[PDB]
Design a protein around this ligand. Structure first.
Ligand code: NA
Lengths: 217, 219, 225
């Protein structure tokens, strides 16, 4: 129902210790990247946020992260979900710590929110108060600065991004032009923490507005 | 069943009255683009044709138009369909005029056509007699020149395009190599209105022939 | 169930006997490519392997070969499957021979293999003893050399590729980074025939290992969280 949280799920987790040189080459790993932590989940943007959180908690880097075409509901195999993330670190210890931080964040109550009665429109509006090394790089902003991470389906996202930009003193850093691999859209916005928060609130209200009246113009 | 029209549906329409400058920057809008019209539907190629029609009825430009991966049948949310289109114009009234023309066209009886008994193969074979500003740019031709807009599933499209090019006095402008986002394929062909119609008929006939004999190649 | 073969199916096959110049241009065909053979099927990597086998049987080149977004189980039309392949040759007779070889290979018993009880995880671990002109060009090796053709879903593939590279004297030629259009991943590895076989064996074992215990990490390392 409307305002219900859609719980994200982790599907599989594995560690690679002493990664093969051939694989290290193709992933373009650094010399201190000896171990990899692999994760898949059924919700990509929650996982991207959680991987960023991991870079704060442990000496890991996000070296690979991609979404699956047409999203988790169209997965053809059990563990594909709609995202794969790869953390790299100096040892299995640091990679396990990074994976533990990722898992803790994914279970923390964050997620997409339903905008209607059968949960067929949903959105993500997450304020990241202090970015780690992954989302700051993706947005092109300085490490440690705040972001608003806003995602909705294509039309809702375009309409609601406009409302979010008018509601607060925020800049658009990165535009997820529709379609993303999962057929969503959105953006990463930056500004002060309170402005990002304001942007999140306005974004959520605007998506809900479209959901309640999709054809009115 | 065979030759039935598959009716396209509009899922959502919105107008942004005064677009924020941050948005205008990322969409690379021109300074006179003040208002946006947004539309989603469950059929991309009909919608692209309709958006082109809107540019003939009003002073609007198509500034954004993209298809969704794996098509409307695989949509995960209610309003995503398989296409988003964005019109831009100098005012909300002009954008409204453009969207009305888009909706009327989508409702006019155009659409994909079934090639078989359970509608599991379908194609689009549409003669655009006078292109607007969107399809003419896309195809690289003068505004007002004719197009055949031909779309089918991947093998059918390759086979039927060859037939259409042989049957009719037409040139290939743009090739949609398989897969498009929706896992279709096709092309835009130009020529006289008469030749584009003949290309449409030959394309339709060839798609039907593949549907009726999908494994036959020894003759 | 586990170790069952998943049978691949051909959906459509056609020949264009004399290709139009307009189409020849867009496909960037060679001057001696006069005829095209078209094929779709519900399994892409088996079909790519079969197309390579065709280049050994007839005077044909693979000029086009692409997978469909989100795979065959999400196809919206009957004949799209998850792959289209296009063979080109100098005459309909050669294309005809190439397509027959392609069909025969697809029916030969090769395929993806199930990794678990409900066939919800599957993988391809195929030892190509003697590459034709298509896979050799793709991998950057000489025609006739061996390949290990390894495909699985994204996390399984990454884990199992590492196992395969450590199991034998093989080199990574081509890496299919996740996701491919079908949301799989994998690689082409080369080495001697026996090394490619060992790599196939280790890959298959590693995929099965993940399938039977995808979240063991939780018990072992996420305790008291
Ligand atoms: Na589906």
């Amino acid at each position: 129902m409307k305002n219900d949280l859609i719980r994200p799920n982790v599907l599989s987790v594995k560690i690679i210790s002493n990664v093969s040189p051939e694989m290290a080459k193709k992933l373009e790993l650094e010399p201190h990247h000896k171990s990899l932590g692999l994760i898949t989940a059924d919700c990509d943007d929650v996982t991207y946020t959680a991987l960023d959180e991991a870079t704060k908690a442990a000496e890991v880097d996000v070296v690979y992260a991609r979404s699956m075409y047409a999203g988790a509901g169209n997965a053809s195999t059990k563990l594909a979900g709609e995202v794969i993330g790869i953390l790299a670190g100096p040892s299995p210890a640091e990679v396990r710590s990074g994976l533990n931080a990722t898992l803790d964040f994914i279970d923390s109550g964050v997620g997409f929110v339903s905008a209607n009665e059968d949960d067929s429109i949903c959105y993500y509006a997450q304020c990241v108060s202090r970015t780690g090394s992954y989302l700051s790089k993706t947005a092109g902003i300085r490490e440690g600065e705040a972001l608003a991470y806003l995602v909705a389906p294509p039309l809702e996202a375009m309409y609601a991004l406009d409302a979010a930009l008018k509601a607060a003193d925020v800049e658009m850093c990165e535009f997820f032009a529709p379609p993303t691999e999962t057929n969503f859209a959105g953006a990463l916005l930056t500004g002060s923490q309170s402005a990002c928060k304001a942007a999140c609130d306005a974004f959520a209200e605007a998506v809900q507005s479209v959901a309640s009246n999709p054809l009115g113009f």
